[PDB]
Structure 1
């Protein structure tokens, strides 16, 4: 069961889903839950909300919590009783996971979430989620009892700079309208956010335009709203004016419409490190208390701790609404972040108004963290990092679960980055790895372990590429899967170099250099975004072991045979601190000879620049970056 319920009593007896049933309360229960029931489908089945005729017999069993439910299955009768309509739907989501092979376990469940708002903020920089991916997201939220979707992609020009003042065009508006309908069907609050701050004026004209935009969104069906003031400079960062604007939205709009739910703001000082030592106490004191204030923790990317959440709560005078910056990867775009969700304290549910997760631009790939966050935020006390990661992967790709686990286990670290934020990766093999190298610079078992791992990586790569159960997932990860397969091939060849004769070693060597060039070409042709282009994989443990083992066994060959083989581990056609090639930049990692003559563009230097005006260039002699026409 995911999320695991607050309370559960299992009897050890089984019951056939009744071939013949009597439905009580289907005309009065939450239509969204009734629809799920009738699809899954004499024995009495009672569905309803506390107060309904159908479930009055169980009124004492129903948890007195928002979104709570009582679920019961026995030989005699089935009860599916929400404390409110969402609760009934959540009872159904649990019910569907009990139903296996046409059979049900005899169980009594009393359930409710520990955190009031739980979900995803699409708030990353980069390519926003497609329409299809958002639709699929919303269904997945409902299955996993996430009730919050904060729409806020940084690069949607109608969400942020400069066209936040304009209504969405017809096509986009028709799409959002559908998203809102689908969200409603899955018991998700669609929260449309706006990000006006970089150029907002504190006047009537901009105040009114912002309210007019919210009204347009409201006409599209939107019933929750957010205003983000993060990552901005200038007058838009003034706390009094922020609070005043939010209170004005609250009082003229959120409390005037009959049916507005969440009103949320993201502060400019949204993590402890970025907070000056009185912006936050001004917000805490001036902002209407029903208004939510977001917070990403001690740092832009951090895990939430008891000390950290108590620090925020005291300044803002309400429980912080957490924006958790994982698995967002818009600052490490060359990595996928498919590891487990961990690091957040599991005893601080009462200290938070909400918990949402900023995910990767890769929507399906994000379902691993998302499913885990859902589990954490509903039942933090029973949150099991590893089992939930395994369950996520198995729900997302039942046909190739083991292969996805293999891929995901070696694609979880961010690599070095400006935020200093890291994740564990490849922990199972790390001991055999680190002992194999030390000895080299070995136990047979460690060698076979590495060998087993490479073999497995290839099996996983090839089965994943060809999987048809979740095609959109496979499209997202495909470039990394190719790179992952290459890595495992390079690993097998390097191990063969460690093991017979001069001639066989040179065959393996030459095959390695070819594999290095293949990885380079995948890195230059896939995922060519402006910020961190290319495709890295297995970066924490595996690639480093392979490269170092390669440097080492070559060194020993040159010593033994008086040879002069090149020991370089990453292919690089240009010559010169490694050179890098990023799009049409050739740069010295913070005399260069290129592999051919190109038209030059510019040379940028920091210890400065010169335009080259398309002059032909092969040699550059003196950041340190050459930009060519390519």
Structure 2
């Protein structure tokens, strides 16, 4: 199992021992970051190097001729880790580290390279920006999954957006950015520093000079890739001719002047199909090397063949995709922990880049991020479900089943202004649907369904309790804890409500009162946890499980009230 899966893989059904004695050719000429991964993992010859190095001369026809490509070979006689370029060598090592299992390797031959040129993450959501420690952890994770791109653009950073985009970062923060940049470098990730000036930009010399001075300060802190964001603004900063002129100016006086600038990227104001001469003005005027970002047919959407042709026709270049999932900044009471799916797997050539805007919950986003990394590297082989399982097992190996259970009932967004939904709880959804119907109509429910609902609530309780106490990824557990409490409460409510379904008039009373107490505890968590100004609270298992419970409760309470002439409160 390899994530992302390589372009080409031939496996020989033999295994070799990681050599106790070995001879390393190329250690001094190969990418230092790749050599470092190799030595920590470690007579038999091992050859490491970039094409052009004396170490790998014998394999140069083996090395794929692609940016970031690599040839990797393991057999009983030798090991070869040969990049087409320095980052390709590092990528060989990240594949190599996954082959190693118990001091053993399979005999293989891999030729690999990314299908999409830029792959990664844009921290571009509304809400609490990622902590410094969060970001350090992200960048290690990106290099492991061959994501080469991190776009730094937290809407609420005042040195990124209006009005202090004009001011150098204060010393403390600048030292932090500088560390991020060094750590990105170590993990072969391009730190792309974004600026968001359009809300108060003046199309004059004063503001244009300030923007270049700011980019120059960022250059001094090590930054080598840059973006200019014009998303979600109003006023004169939306002018497409002015924007293109600015980006072209930046390109002419900065990106073409410095020896080593990599990505120059812009996010347009009209960044999705439903929100549109703006696009053709940019496509025609903006220098061809400059990237243009795009979220799809709507603010939140998945990328289709027709959707991507539509945009590429207007911008006159392959669109650099900003995918708004798992971003939850418009449904902040939900965690979106489901599979990444819905994106067309045959359009790699029609995109310059593919990044995912994640949740404010950094560790919880690694499930989707790991999947996006898999998809963007090798879309033709992208496997939604398997990759979601591999993500979870990679992130929490000590409690993989429990995180799966929690994530599979924490996927949908609930009703929202963007109209964007995800599947959730599909496993039990038939059994749920059948159970509910047998009440609506007044018939006997199938027993197997009752038990499947029991088993589901039980596994939910187990997973909640185990996740709470897990110490392998504490930051993850801190992020999800309030939803964990609420998820456990849901499961307990579920067990008690089913017990109410199985008839004693005094037993039913105990169980009803118990359920009233559980509802109250859930109200309390919803009223005191995650109290943001927009979608306060904590909602979990909303698509299928919570309605199933609430409906079943309202039904059985009604039957009871009709039977014993009582007036129990049937609300939820």
* Class of the TM-score when normalised by the shorter of the 2 chains: over 0.9
2:451 matched residue in structure 1: 448
CA distance in 2, matches of 1:262, 1:255: 11
CA distance in 2, matches of 1:568, 1:42: 75
2:473 matched residue in structure 1: 470
Please list the CA deviations of residues 392-425 of structure 1 after superposition, one character each: whole Å capped at 9, or x if unmatched: 0000000000000000000000000000000000
Q: Give the superposition deviation at 1:195.
A: 0.4
CA distance in 2, matches of 1:233, 1:175: 31
1:99-248 residue pairs with structure 2 within 5 A? 99-248=100-249
Please list the CA deviations of residues 544-578 of structure 1 after superposition, one character each: whole Å capped at 9, or x if unmatched: 00000000000100011110000001xxxxxxxxx
CA distance in 2, matches of 1:311, 1:282: 15
CA distance in 1, matches of 2:326, 2:162: 25
Please list the CA deviations of residues 215-264 of structure 1 after superposition, one character each: whole Å capped at 9, or x if unmatched: 11010000000000010111100000000000000000001000000000
CA distance in 2, matches of 1:264, 1:99: 38
CA distance in 1, matches of 2:241, 2:12: 58
Please list the CA deviations of residues 28-79 of structure 1 after superposition, one character each: whole Å capped at 9, or x if unmatched: 0000000000000000000000111000100001000000000000000000
Please list the CA deviations of residues 427-485 of structure 1 after superposition, one character each: whole Å capped at 9, or x if unmatched: 01000000011112911100000000000000000000000000000000000000000
Q: Give the superposition deviation at 1:95.
A: 0.1
1:253 matched residue in structure 2: 254
CA distance in 2, matches of 1:273, 1:356: 20
SS of the aligned residue for 1:135 comes to: helix
Q: Give the superposition deviation at 1:161.
A: 1.5
CA distance in 2, matches of 1:502, 1:166: 71
CA distance in 2, matches of 1:488, 1:309: 42
Please list the CA deviations of residues 150-187 of structure 1 after superposition, one character each: whole Å capped at 9, or x if unmatched: 00010111111221111111111000000000000000
CA distance in 2, matches of 1:48, 1:286: 41
Between 543-552 and 440-449, the greater mean CA deviation after superposition: 440-449
1:378 matched residue in structure 2: 377
Greater fraction of residues in strand: 1
SS of the aligned residue for 2:499 comes to: helix
SS of the aligned residue for 2:60 comes to: helix
Between 550-559 and 160-169, the greater mean CA deviation after superposition: 160-169
Between 344-353 and 158-167, the greater mean CA deviation after superposition: 158-167
CA distance in 2, matches of 1:501, 1:437: 23
CA distance in 1, matches of 2:175, 2:307: 41
Q: Give the superposition deviation at 1:500.
A: 3.2
SS of the aligned residue for 2:296 comes to: coil
Q: Give the superposition deviation at 1:495.
A: 0.2
CA distance in 1, matches of 2:421, 2:495: 28
1:610 matched residue in structure 2: none
- What CA RMSD, in Å, does the superposition of the two structures yield over aligned residues? 0.6
CA distance in 1, matches of 2:562, 2:57: 85
CA distance in 2, matches of 1:229, 1:426: 38
SS of the aligned residue for 1:394 comes to: helix
2:426 matched residue in structure 1: 427
Structure 1 unmatched runs, 5+? 570-630
1:515-526 residue pairs with structure 2 within 5 A? 515-526=518-529
Please list the CA deviations of residues 100-131 of structure 1 after superposition, one character each: whole Å capped at 9, or x if unmatched: 00000000000000000000000000000000
SS of the aligned residue for 1:149 comes to: strand
SS of the aligned residue for 1:72 comes to: strand
TM-score (norm 1): 0.90
Q: Give the superposition deviation at 1:337.
A: 0.2
Please state if 1:535 is matched with 2:534.
no
Please list the CA deviations of residues 560-616 of structure 1 after superposition, one character each: whole Å capped at 9, or x if unmatched: 1110000001xxxxxxxxxxxxxxxxxxxxxxxxxxxxxxxxxxxxxxxxxxxxxxx
CA distance in 2, matches of 1:61, 1:445: 57
CA distance in 2, matches of 1:12, 1:370: 31
Q: Give the superposition deviation at 1:388.
A: 0.1
Q: Which runs of 4+ in 1 moved over 2 A?
A: none
2:346 matched residue in structure 1: 347
Please list the CA deviations of residues 128-153 of structure 1 after superposition, one character each: whole Å capped at 9, or x if unmatched: 00000000000000000000000001
How many residue pairs are counted as aligned between the two chains?
567
CA distance in 2, matches of 1:172, 1:447: 56
CA distance in 2, matches of 1:183, 1:503: 64
CA distance in 2, matches of 1:217, 1:190: 11
Structure 2 unmatched runs, 5+? none
Please list the CA deviations of residues 517-562 of structure 1 after superposition, one character each: whole Å capped at 9, or x if unmatched: 0001001111011110100000000000000000000010001111
1:298 matched residue in structure 2: 297
SS of the aligned residue for 1:528 comes to: coil
The answer to which structure, 1 or 2, has the higher relative contact order (CA under 8 A, 6+ apart) is: 2
CA distance in 2, matches of 1:442, 1:32: 61
CA distance in 2, matches of 1:82, 1:274: 43
